Amino acid sequence: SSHPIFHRGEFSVCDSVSVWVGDKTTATDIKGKEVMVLGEVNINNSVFKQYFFETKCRDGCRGIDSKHWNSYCTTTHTFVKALTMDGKQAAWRFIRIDTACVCVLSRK
Amino acid sequence: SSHPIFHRGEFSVCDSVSVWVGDKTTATDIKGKEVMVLGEVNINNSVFKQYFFETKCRDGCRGIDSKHWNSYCTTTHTFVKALTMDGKQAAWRFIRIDTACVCVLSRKA
Amino acid sequence: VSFPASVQLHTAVEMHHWCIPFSVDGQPAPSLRWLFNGSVLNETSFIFTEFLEPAANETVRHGCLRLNQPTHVNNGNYTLLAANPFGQASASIMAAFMDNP
Amino acid sequence: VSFPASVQLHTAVEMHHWCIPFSVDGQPAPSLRWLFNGSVLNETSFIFTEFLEPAANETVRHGCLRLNQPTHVNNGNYTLLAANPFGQASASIMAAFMDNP
Incomplete structure (x- = not known):
């Protein structure tokens, strides 16, 4: 509708x-x-x-002035604590996970 | 520079x-x-x-076609587990925290 | 001329925030009220009702139940209640913003 | 004309990604290698060297050590090593990306 x-x-x-x-x-x-x-x-x-x-990004960017800018959407991350195996022992460590989807500008 | x-x-x-x-x-x-x-x-x-x-946003967005769009930057969140308190209830609950700053688009006219 | 409330909901959509689009008519203008799974939904800064600017020469109002990053816990049946002195109009819709293991 | 390598680094700058700008010349063109706090820095998908497109008739190359969302653990002295037959040029710079706990 x-x-x-x-x-x-x-x-x-x-x-x-x-x-x-x-x-x-x-x-x-x-x-x-x-x-x-x-x-x-x-x-x-x-x-x-x-x-x-x-x-993460859902399958340039919206509203971009395509006359002066190139653009693309991309997934950025964040650091979150988690129970991990450091390659030796069990530890509470900050790991990288997807957290948003942003627009990247590049001049024309 | x-x-x-x-x-x-x-x-x-x-x-x-x-x-x-x-x-x-x-x-x-x-x-x-x-x-x-x-x-x-x-x-x-x-x-x-x-x-x-x-x-969070470093307090309209860059590169936007301002002829056709109003816009501004804003802080978006993520949910992360945290030891919190609700009464005598210390619990392992998901809370809301700042995780990015995105551009909000809005048509004008 | 005064007339009873009329109401309709549209299937939830994700823009910057999620939004359950609504349209309501009536004069006096009806008071809006939401229910989540049959029980009252208290608006907060993350789940609130929002009207668009009123159009000239019309009593009909358009807006959204606005959800700022809802989770599977907000999945459910949303009822919009529109009331004025003639009685009440009602509209409901199922919304799923996230799965929930 | 063949000539020894020359190299310089600029103050780290945060754009979409963080970047430690660098400019390097030399003929033959030098091979590049980075150090972090005096030890070999192995490039990854999140910390790597990126060259800008070479400009018209000039052997000088520009670029960045690109850091994708670096934290305080990346704070330190960054050294770029430009090597060719004549020998090697080096340049260092301190970069702070975030205050530590």
């Missing part, structure tokens, strides 16, 4: 998609090292299966 | 800044409820100081 909002609403320059990732087994740490992600963790009790909130 | 890159480089549409946030006391959970954020957490006998990687 035709609703005024498709014309007058606030849109994104880049389209993304958020999902819940619970089958992550590897990731790169803050040292850029590849590390193993535990499927589970447990706080002085039962276990919490490790899940992650991720947002 | 005469380096070619200052001209032929890849630029952000919206500028952000990234910091480690460690003084966070309150936050809102996945249900939108204002909850308390503890400063330490016990992950397997190992006491941890609760820290967060946050990205």
Whole structure:
């Protein structure tokens, strides 16, 4: 249907998609090292299966002045703590996960 | 500032800044409820100081066709697990935290 | 001339924020109220009702239930209740913003 | 005409990605290698060298050591080593990307 909002609403320059990732087994740490992600963790009790909130680019950018700029959408990341296997022992470490989808400018 | 890159480089549409946030006391959970954020957490006998990687707008967006569009940059979030408090209930809940700065498009006229 | 409230909802869509588009008519203008799964939805800064600017020569209003990054926990049936002195008009819609393992 | 390598680095700058700009000349053109705090820095998908397109008739090359979302663990002294038959040129610069905890 035709609703005024498709014309007058606030849109994104880049389209993304958020999902819940619970089958992550590897990731790169803050040292850029590849590390193993535990499927589970447990706080002085039962276990919490490790899940992650991720947002990546949904399959140039919208509203770009194509006369002076080239552009593209791309997935940026964030650092989040996680129970990992450092390649030696189990540790709480910051891993890199998808977190947003942004627009990249480049002059013409 | 005469380096070619200052001209032929890849630029952000919206500028952000990234910091480690460690003084966070309150936050809102996945249900939108204002909850308390503890400063330490016990992950397997190992006491941890609760820290967060946050990205926010550096306070219209760059490269936008301003003839046809109003626009501005804004801080978007991510949900991350954190030891919080709701009553005498210290829990492992997802909270809302800054994670990016995106450009919001809006037609004019 | 006063007339009863009329209401309609549209299938939720994702723009910058997610939005459940609505259109309501009536005069006096109806008061809006949302229900999530049959129970009242309290608006907050992340889930709130939003009207577009009023058009000239028309009583009909257009807007959105605006959801700022909702999760699977916001999946459900959304009911918009529009009320004025003649009674109440109602419209509902199912919305899914995220799966939920 | 053959000539020894010359090299310079510029203050790190945050754009879409962070970048440590560099300009290098020499004939034969030199091979490049980076150091982080005096030790070999192995390039990855997140920290690598990128050349800008060579300009018209001039052997000088410009580019960046590109850092994709670097943290405080990347803070330190970055050294670019330009080598050719004549020998080697070097340039270093300190870069802070984020304050540590």
